[PDB]
């Protein structure tokens, strides 16, 4: 079967969708340790505008403290509690 | 509240996950169209392998198909059937 | 999965002598090796580790200078060079592993051997 | 360097008893930081056996009487059940660092 048009528009336009991020560029300054899992399922804005002046943004935003393995090569590991950002509510606005 | 760190590492292993992918990055020679919408649901490989020597890949793959508005910018539009490619079943894997 | 420890004895004072702890049931390439002692009636005291890919090491100061850690990654086989041993080296060795690379804490220890210094 | 704490230094409890035991860590550790410390249990001329791993975690192939939990600077190692092959030496260990350091040990002798 074919996904019709109106469909693959509607499930494709900019919202709150389950993103797996990378913790390193969630904290890019933070080379001292390694982190296990190395990537965190956060709900972030994802999909398409449909109009190259307009890009898929939050408007409303919350934190999310997750516990990770943080491992110090050579020296040890323990588990931090971290916190992240999540994004209730996406809009399409100009750039 | 905190999410514990065994439900972290489990939400996070390589599996597929619905993520939403730019149509010109899966056709990347198109020259005469843009696309609306500009990126499409798909079925796809995602999350971390906790192995800086893994990486998360597909096994078992499908084709979905679906009707995408192509637009030749100050010509016209149409609406075309477009294929694209789905991951069924993840696992972690050697580079 | 196993570790088993052989080469403990009777060493007089100042002297030397080497432990050597055989692996199976897995590579000692992947993970961290460890020796820690027992003194007679008291705790453990962790002594050494190796990373024995790149031959990364690292010892409690009380052994500092005097022991060596080693591995030999083809016979999958670690091992101690104790040198300028006191009576308070005496002890049960034990040799462990971490499980893996990103495992600090100790899973299989081996069965022990007994240094005894004195003359 | 950082030393660990343990307490009780022996106790003595009877068949069917939850035993607590208790680990403290030296140096400042804030409650955000958790699964740094191992469990284990020594028998009488006998390797010490992994009963805890990170914290709270039980090892496999221990029996599910043993527990633990913890945070900042203090853990605690339980067993809900007390057996009389529970008899031994129970030791903690940090690696939040290295050296890695281990507990003083504490005694638990079956009251009969």
């Known amino acids: 079967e074919v996904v019709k048009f109106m469909d693959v528009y509607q499930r494709s336009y900019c919202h709150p969708i389950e993103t797996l991020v990378d913790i390193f560029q969630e904290y890019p300054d933070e080379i001292e340790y390694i982190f296990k899992p190395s990537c965190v399922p956060l709900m972030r804005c994802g999909g398409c505008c449909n109009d190259e002046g307009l890009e898929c943004v939050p408007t409303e935003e919350s934190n999310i403290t997750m516990q990770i393995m943080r491992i110090k090569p050579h020296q040890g590991q323990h588990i931090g509690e971290m916190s992240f950002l999540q994004h209730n509510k996406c809009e399409c606005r100009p750039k | 509240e905190v999410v514990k760190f065994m439900d972290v590492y489990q939400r996070s292993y390589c599996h597929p996950i619905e993520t939403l992918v730019d149509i010109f990055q899966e056709y990347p020679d198109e020259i005469e169209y843009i696309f609306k919408p500009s990126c499409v649901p798909l079925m796809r490989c995602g999350g971390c392998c906790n192995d800086e020597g893994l990486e998360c890949v597909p096994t078992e793959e499908s084709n979905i198909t679906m009707q995408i508005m192509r637009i030749k910018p100050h010509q016209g539009q149409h609406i075309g059937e477009m294929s694209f490619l789905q991951h069924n079943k993840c696992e972690c894997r050697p580079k | 999965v196993q570790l088993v420890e052989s080469g403990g004895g009777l060493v007089q004072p100042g002297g030397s002598l080497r432990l050597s702890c055989a692996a199976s049931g897995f590579n000692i390439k992947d993970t961290y090796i460890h020796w820690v002692r027992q003194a007679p009636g008291k705790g453990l005291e962790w002594v050494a580790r190796?990373?024995?890919?790149?031959?990364?090491?690292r010892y409690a100061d009380s052994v500092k200078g005097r022991f060596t850690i080693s591995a030999d990654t083809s016979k999958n086989t670690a091992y101690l060079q104790m040198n300028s041993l006191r009576a308070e080296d005496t002890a049960v060795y034990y040799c462990?592993?971490?499980?893996?690379?990103?495992?600090?804490?100790?899973?299989?220890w081996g069965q022990g051997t007994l240094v005894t210094v004195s003359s | 360097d950082i030393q660990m704490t343990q307490s009780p230094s022996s106790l003595s409890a009877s068949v069917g008893d939850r035993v607590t035991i208790t680990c403290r860590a030296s140096?400042?550790?804030?409650?955000?930081?958790?699964?740094?410390v191992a469990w284990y249990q020594q028998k009488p001329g006998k390797a010490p056996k992994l009963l805890i791993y990170?914290?709270?975690y039980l090892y496999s192939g221990v029996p599910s009487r043993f527990s633990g939990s913890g945070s900042g600077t203090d853990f605690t190692l339980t067993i809900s059940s007390l057996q009389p092959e529970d008899f031994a030496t129970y030791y903690c260990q940090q690696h939040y660092t290295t050296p890695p350091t281990f507990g003083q040990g504490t005694k638990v002798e079956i009251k009969r």
């Open positions: 140096q400042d550790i804030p409650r955000s930081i958790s699964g740094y």
């Open positions: 462990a592993r971490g499980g893996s690379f990103y495992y600090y804490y100790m899973d299989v």
């Open positions: 190796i990373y024995p890919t790149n031959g990364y090491t």
């Open positions: 990170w914290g709270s």
